[PDB]
Amino acid sequence: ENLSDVFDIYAICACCKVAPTSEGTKNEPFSPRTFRGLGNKGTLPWKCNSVDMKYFRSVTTYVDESKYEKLKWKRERYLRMNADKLQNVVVMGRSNWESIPKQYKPLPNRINVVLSKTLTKEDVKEKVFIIDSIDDLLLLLKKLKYYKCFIIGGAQVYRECLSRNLIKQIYFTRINGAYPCDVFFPEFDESEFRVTSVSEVYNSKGTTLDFLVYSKV
Ligand SMILES: NC(=O)C1=CN([C@@H]2O[C@H](COP(=O)(O)OP(=O)(O)OC[C@H]3O[C@@H](n4cnc5c(N)ncnc54)[C@H](OP(=O)(O)O)[C@@H]3O)[C@@H](O)[C@H]2O)C=CC1
Ligand SMILES: CCc1nc(N)nc(N)c1-c1ccc(Cl)cc1
């Protein structure tokens, strides 16, 4: 009855502290969420961060063949009632797909999926599934051999999956720095997600950061 568990749908993101503004109705100097800044002008708020990229890459790439068996059965039973290299699935919005550096798209060692009702195969020469909605993602997953399904961006992609309770875990990176932002991470029922992993602190050129993991418990 839990699709996020049956199809191992997780979410991964990186958020920073929002940089204040002296004009407008959007300045929150006492926000209860110190880390809510997701993007700024179609780009990352902090630009580049070697550690986070390394972490994100590792996480969304790692596969354990010695664990797929259990997963295959879990999905077979559900479906009831192709010798393809085992890989994870990454799901992104059109913007995110259009920002990836040419030499990184499609994401290496990963099955890429882009949510869009505008793009077409004719215009994208790279291998990647294009879907109209989350419902189509579900369909795709029901008939696709993969390890885990990672949602990597952006705002609305995250917001629809949460509200539809399709998220088993959340990989949350906390960038410790203030940056101007215009896109933020959506809010969710914190109560149904308990923090199950708290990493040590890390440093990326004076900018500290850490990695958390919440599990729908
Ligand atoms: N720090 C982090 O971890 C992350 C940061 N970001 C940042 O976020 C900003 C991008 O934000 P945003 O424009 O929201 O990004 P998206 O990548 O979601 O692009 C929006 C577009 O994606 C499509 N889309 C989004 N949701 C859906 C949906 N539910 N169904 C179908 N299509 C959908 C639409 O395409 P169409 O119009 O073709 O239908 C849409 O107009 C950037 O600055 C990026 O760097 C993004 C992810 C993670
Ligand atoms: C390395 C950035 C990064 N770090 C973390 N922690 N989570 C993410 N989801 C992304 C990310 C954002 C946009 C694209 Cl297009 C690909 C990945």
Short mmCIF file of N, CA and C in Angstrom, two decimals, residues 83-189:
data_model
loop_
_atom_site.label_atom_id
_atom_site.label_comp_id
_atom_site.label_asym_id
_atom_site.label_seq_id
_atom_site.Cartn_x
_atom_site.Cartn_y
_atom_site.Cartn_z
N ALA A 83 17.86 -8.31 -17.61
CA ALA A 83 19.28 -8.64 -17.65
C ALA A 83 20.03 -7.38 -18.08
N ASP A 84 19.54 -6.23 -17.60
CA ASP A 84 20.13 -4.92 -17.90
C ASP A 84 21.06 -4.55 -16.74
N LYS A 85 22.17 -3.86 -17.04
CA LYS A 85 23.12 -3.45 -16.00
C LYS A 85 22.32 -2.73 -14.92
N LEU A 86 22.39 -3.20 -13.69
CA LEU A 86 21.63 -2.57 -12.62
C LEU A 86 22.04 -1.11 -12.41
N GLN A 87 21.06 -0.21 -12.41
CA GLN A 87 21.30 1.22 -12.21
C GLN A 87 20.14 1.91 -11.47
N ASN A 88 20.42 3.08 -10.90
CA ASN A 88 19.38 3.84 -10.21
C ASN A 88 18.70 4.76 -11.21
N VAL A 89 17.59 5.33 -10.78
CA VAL A 89 16.83 6.23 -11.61
C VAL A 89 16.90 7.62 -10.99
N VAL A 90 17.14 8.64 -11.82
CA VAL A 90 17.16 10.03 -11.36
C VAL A 90 16.06 10.79 -12.12
N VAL A 91 15.27 11.58 -11.40
CA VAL A 91 14.15 12.29 -12.01
C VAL A 91 14.25 13.81 -11.84
N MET A 92 14.27 14.54 -12.95
CA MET A 92 14.39 16.00 -12.85
C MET A 92 13.41 16.79 -13.72
N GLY A 93 13.26 18.07 -13.39
CA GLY A 93 12.39 18.96 -14.12
C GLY A 93 13.12 19.46 -15.34
N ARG A 94 12.41 20.09 -16.28
CA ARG A 94 13.08 20.57 -17.47
C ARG A 94 14.23 21.51 -17.16
N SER A 95 14.03 22.48 -16.27
CA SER A 95 15.09 23.42 -15.93
C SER A 95 16.36 22.71 -15.54
N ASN A 96 16.26 21.83 -14.55
CA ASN A 96 17.42 21.08 -14.08
C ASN A 96 18.11 20.33 -15.19
N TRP A 97 17.32 19.73 -16.08
CA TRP A 97 17.92 18.98 -17.18
C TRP A 97 18.69 19.93 -18.10
N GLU A 98 18.11 21.10 -18.34
CA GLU A 98 18.72 22.09 -19.22
C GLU A 98 19.93 22.81 -18.62
N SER A 99 20.26 22.52 -17.37
CA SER A 99 21.39 23.19 -16.72
C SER A 99 22.62 22.28 -16.62
N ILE A 100 22.40 20.98 -16.70
CA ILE A 100 23.53 20.07 -16.61
C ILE A 100 24.61 20.36 -17.66
N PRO A 101 25.88 20.41 -17.22
CA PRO A 101 27.04 20.66 -18.10
C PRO A 101 27.02 19.63 -19.23
N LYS A 102 27.19 20.09 -20.47
CA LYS A 102 27.17 19.22 -21.64
C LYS A 102 27.90 17.89 -21.48
N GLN A 103 29.04 17.89 -20.78
CA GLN A 103 29.81 16.67 -20.62
C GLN A 103 29.36 15.78 -19.46
N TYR A 104 28.19 16.09 -18.90
CA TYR A 104 27.62 15.33 -17.78
C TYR A 104 26.22 14.84 -18.09
N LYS A 105 25.66 15.32 -19.20
CA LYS A 105 24.33 14.92 -19.59
C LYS A 105 24.41 13.95 -20.75
N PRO A 106 23.75 12.79 -20.64
CA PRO A 106 22.94 12.37 -19.48
C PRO A 106 23.82 12.02 -18.27
N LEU A 107 23.28 12.08 -17.06
CA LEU A 107 24.08 11.75 -15.89
C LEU A 107 24.67 10.36 -16.07
N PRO A 108 25.99 10.24 -15.88
CA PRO A 108 26.72 8.98 -16.03
C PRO A 108 26.25 7.92 -15.08
N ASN A 109 26.25 6.68 -15.56
CA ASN A 109 25.89 5.54 -14.74
C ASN A 109 24.51 5.64 -14.11
N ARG A 110 23.60 6.37 -14.73
CA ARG A 110 22.27 6.53 -14.15
C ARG A 110 21.20 6.65 -15.22
N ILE A 111 20.03 6.10 -14.93
CA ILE A 111 18.92 6.18 -15.85
C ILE A 111 18.23 7.53 -15.61
N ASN A 112 18.39 8.45 -16.56
CA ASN A 112 17.80 9.79 -16.46
C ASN A 112 16.34 9.87 -16.90
N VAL A 113 15.55 10.65 -16.17
CA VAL A 113 14.14 10.84 -16.51
C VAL A 113 13.85 12.32 -16.36
N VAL A 114 13.19 12.91 -17.35
CA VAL A 114 12.87 14.33 -17.28
C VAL A 114 11.36 14.55 -17.39
N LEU A 115 10.82 15.28 -16.42
CA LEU A 115 9.40 15.61 -16.39
C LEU A 115 9.19 16.87 -17.18
N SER A 116 8.42 16.74 -18.26
CA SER A 116 8.12 17.85 -19.13
C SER A 116 7.02 17.48 -20.11
N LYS A 117 6.16 18.45 -20.42
CA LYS A 117 5.10 18.19 -21.39
C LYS A 117 5.40 18.97 -22.67
N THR A 118 6.61 19.54 -22.74
CA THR A 118 7.00 20.32 -23.92
C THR A 118 8.10 19.67 -24.78
N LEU A 119 9.18 19.20 -24.15
CA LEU A 119 10.28 18.56 -24.88
C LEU A 119 9.84 17.30 -25.65
N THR A 120 10.65 16.92 -26.65
CA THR A 120 10.40 15.76 -27.50
C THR A 120 11.70 15.06 -27.85
N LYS A 121 11.62 13.77 -28.17
CA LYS A 121 12.80 12.99 -28.51
C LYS A 121 13.63 13.56 -29.66
N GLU A 122 12.95 14.16 -30.63
CA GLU A 122 13.60 14.73 -31.81
C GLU A 122 14.67 15.76 -31.46
N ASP A 123 14.39 16.56 -30.44
CA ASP A 123 15.29 17.62 -29.99
C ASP A 123 16.35 17.22 -28.96
N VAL A 124 16.16 16.09 -28.27
CA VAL A 124 17.14 15.65 -27.29
C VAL A 124 17.81 14.37 -27.78
N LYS A 125 19.07 14.50 -28.19
CA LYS A 125 19.84 13.38 -28.74
C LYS A 125 20.39 12.42 -27.69
N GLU A 126 20.32 12.84 -26.43
CA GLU A 126 20.81 12.03 -25.31
C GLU A 126 19.76 11.04 -24.83
N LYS A 127 20.23 9.92 -24.27
CA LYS A 127 19.33 8.88 -23.77
C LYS A 127 18.70 9.32 -22.47
N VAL A 128 17.38 9.38 -22.47
CA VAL A 128 16.65 9.78 -21.28
C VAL A 128 15.17 9.64 -21.55
N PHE A 129 14.43 9.21 -20.53
CA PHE A 129 12.99 9.07 -20.65
C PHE A 129 12.40 10.45 -20.39
N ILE A 130 11.35 10.79 -21.11
CA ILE A 130 10.70 12.07 -20.91
C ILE A 130 9.28 11.72 -20.52
N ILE A 131 8.79 12.28 -19.42
CA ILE A 131 7.44 11.96 -18.95
C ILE A 131 6.59 13.19 -18.70
N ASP A 132 5.28 13.07 -18.93
CA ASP A 132 4.35 14.18 -18.75
C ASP A 132 3.99 14.49 -17.30
N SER A 133 4.09 13.49 -16.42
CA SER A 133 3.70 13.67 -15.03
C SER A 133 4.27 12.61 -14.12
N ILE A 134 3.98 12.74 -12.84
CA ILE A 134 4.46 11.75 -11.88
C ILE A 134 3.73 10.44 -12.16
N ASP A 135 2.46 10.52 -12.49
CA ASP A 135 1.72 9.31 -12.79
C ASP A 135 2.39 8.51 -13.87
N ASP A 136 3.02 9.19 -14.82
CA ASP A 136 3.68 8.47 -15.89
C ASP A 136 4.99 7.87 -15.40
N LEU A 137 5.53 8.47 -14.35
CA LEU A 137 6.78 8.01 -13.72
C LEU A 137 6.49 6.67 -13.08
N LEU A 138 5.36 6.63 -12.39
CA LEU A 138 4.89 5.44 -11.74
C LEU A 138 4.79 4.33 -12.79
N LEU A 139 4.05 4.59 -13.85
CA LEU A 139 3.91 3.63 -14.93
C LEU A 139 5.27 3.15 -15.40
N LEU A 140 6.16 4.08 -15.71
CA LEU A 140 7.48 3.73 -16.18
C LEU A 140 8.17 2.80 -15.18
N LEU A 141 8.15 3.17 -13.91
CA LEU A 141 8.79 2.35 -12.87
C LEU A 141 8.20 0.93 -12.73
N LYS A 142 6.90 0.80 -12.97
CA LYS A 142 6.23 -0.49 -12.86
C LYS A 142 6.78 -1.47 -13.88
N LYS A 143 7.41 -0.97 -14.93
CA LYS A 143 7.96 -1.88 -15.93
C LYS A 143 9.38 -1.51 -16.32
N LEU A 144 10.23 -1.34 -15.32
CA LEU A 144 11.60 -0.96 -15.55
C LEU A 144 12.49 -1.55 -14.45
N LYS A 145 13.59 -2.19 -14.85
CA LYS A 145 14.53 -2.78 -13.90
C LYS A 145 15.53 -1.70 -13.47
N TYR A 146 15.51 -1.39 -12.17
CA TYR A 146 16.37 -0.38 -11.56
C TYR A 146 16.54 -0.71 -10.08
N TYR A 147 17.45 -0.01 -9.42
CA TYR A 147 17.72 -0.22 -8.00
C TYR A 147 16.84 0.73 -7.17
N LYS A 148 17.18 2.02 -7.15
CA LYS A 148 16.36 2.97 -6.41
C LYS A 148 15.95 4.08 -7.35
N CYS A 149 14.98 4.88 -6.92
CA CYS A 149 14.51 6.00 -7.72
C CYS A 149 14.74 7.28 -6.94
N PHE A 150 15.63 8.11 -7.47
CA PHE A 150 15.98 9.37 -6.86
C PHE A 150 15.38 10.56 -7.57
N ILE A 151 14.73 11.41 -6.79
CA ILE A 151 14.13 12.63 -7.30
C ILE A 151 15.18 13.69 -6.99
N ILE A 152 15.75 14.30 -8.03
CA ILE A 152 16.80 15.29 -7.84
C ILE A 152 16.48 16.78 -8.04
N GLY A 153 15.25 17.08 -8.46
CA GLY A 153 14.86 18.47 -8.68
C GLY A 153 13.73 18.60 -9.67
N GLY A 154 12.94 19.67 -9.63
CA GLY A 154 13.13 20.72 -8.67
C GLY A 154 11.90 20.94 -7.80
N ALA A 155 11.70 22.17 -7.34
CA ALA A 155 10.60 22.53 -6.44
C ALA A 155 9.27 21.77 -6.58
N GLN A 156 8.61 21.93 -7.73
CA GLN A 156 7.32 21.28 -7.98
C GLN A 156 7.37 19.76 -8.06
N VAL A 157 8.53 19.24 -8.43
CA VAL A 157 8.72 17.81 -8.53
C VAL A 157 8.74 17.21 -7.12
N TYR A 158 9.37 17.96 -6.22
CA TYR A 158 9.50 17.58 -4.82
C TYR A 158 8.16 17.71 -4.11
N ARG A 159 7.49 18.82 -4.39
CA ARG A 159 6.21 19.15 -3.77
C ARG A 159 5.06 18.22 -4.14
N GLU A 160 5.09 17.68 -5.35
CA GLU A 160 4.02 16.80 -5.73
C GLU A 160 4.24 15.43 -5.15
N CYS A 161 5.49 15.00 -5.11
CA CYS A 161 5.80 13.68 -4.58
C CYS A 161 5.53 13.57 -3.09
N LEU A 162 5.80 14.65 -2.36
CA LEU A 162 5.57 14.66 -0.92
C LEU A 162 4.07 14.56 -0.62
N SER A 163 3.32 15.53 -1.13
CA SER A 163 1.88 15.56 -0.93
C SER A 163 1.21 14.24 -1.33
N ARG A 164 1.77 13.54 -2.31
CA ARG A 164 1.20 12.27 -2.73
C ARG A 164 1.84 11.13 -1.98
N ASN A 165 2.55 11.47 -0.91
CA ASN A 165 3.26 10.50 -0.04
C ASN A 165 4.02 9.41 -0.79
N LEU A 166 4.83 9.84 -1.75
CA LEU A 166 5.62 8.95 -2.58
C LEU A 166 7.10 9.02 -2.25
N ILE A 167 7.43 9.48 -1.05
CA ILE A 167 8.83 9.63 -0.61
C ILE A 167 9.15 8.82 0.63
N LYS A 168 10.00 7.81 0.48
CA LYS A 168 10.41 6.96 1.57
C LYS A 168 11.53 7.62 2.38
N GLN A 169 12.53 8.19 1.71
CA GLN A 169 13.62 8.84 2.43
C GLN A 169 14.00 10.16 1.83
N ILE A 170 14.59 11.02 2.64
CA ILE A 170 15.02 12.30 2.13
C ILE A 170 16.48 12.56 2.47
N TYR A 171 17.32 12.64 1.44
CA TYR A 171 18.74 12.93 1.60
C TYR A 171 18.92 14.44 1.56
N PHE A 172 19.04 15.06 2.73
CA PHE A 172 19.15 16.52 2.86
C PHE A 172 20.52 17.09 3.23
N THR A 173 21.16 17.77 2.27
CA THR A 173 22.46 18.42 2.50
C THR A 173 22.18 19.84 2.99
N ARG A 174 22.87 20.27 4.04
CA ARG A 174 22.68 21.62 4.59
C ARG A 174 23.93 22.49 4.35
N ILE A 175 23.87 23.37 3.35
CA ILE A 175 25.00 24.23 3.04
C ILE A 175 24.99 25.37 4.05
N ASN A 176 26.08 25.51 4.81
CA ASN A 176 26.15 26.55 5.83
C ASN A 176 26.68 27.88 5.33
N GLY A 177 25.84 28.60 4.59
CA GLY A 177 26.22 29.89 4.07
C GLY A 177 24.97 30.59 3.59
N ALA A 178 24.99 31.92 3.58
CA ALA A 178 23.87 32.73 3.14
C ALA A 178 24.05 33.07 1.66
N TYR A 179 22.99 32.89 0.88
CA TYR A 179 23.07 33.18 -0.54
C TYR A 179 21.71 33.69 -0.98
N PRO A 180 21.67 34.51 -2.04
CA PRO A 180 20.39 35.02 -2.51
C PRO A 180 19.64 33.84 -3.14
N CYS A 181 18.35 33.72 -2.85
CA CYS A 181 17.55 32.62 -3.37
C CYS A 181 16.21 33.12 -3.91
N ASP A 182 15.61 32.39 -4.85
CA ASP A 182 14.30 32.75 -5.41
C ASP A 182 13.43 31.50 -5.48
N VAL A 183 14.04 30.33 -5.26
CA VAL A 183 13.33 29.03 -5.24
C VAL A 183 13.67 28.36 -3.88
N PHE A 184 12.66 27.84 -3.18
CA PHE A 184 12.91 27.21 -1.88
C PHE A 184 12.39 25.78 -1.80
N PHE A 185 12.87 25.02 -0.81
CA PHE A 185 12.40 23.65 -0.66
C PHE A 185 11.00 23.68 -0.06
N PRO A 186 10.09 22.83 -0.57
CA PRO A 186 8.74 22.84 -0.02
C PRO A 186 8.64 22.31 1.43
N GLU A 187 7.57 22.67 2.14
CA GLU A 187 7.42 22.17 3.51
C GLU A 187 6.65 20.86 3.54
N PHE A 188 7.02 19.99 4.47
CA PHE A 188 6.36 18.71 4.61
C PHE A 188 6.11 18.39 6.09
N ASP A 189 5.24 17.41 6.31
CA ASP A 189 4.88 16.94 7.63
C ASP A 189 6.13 16.30 8.26
#
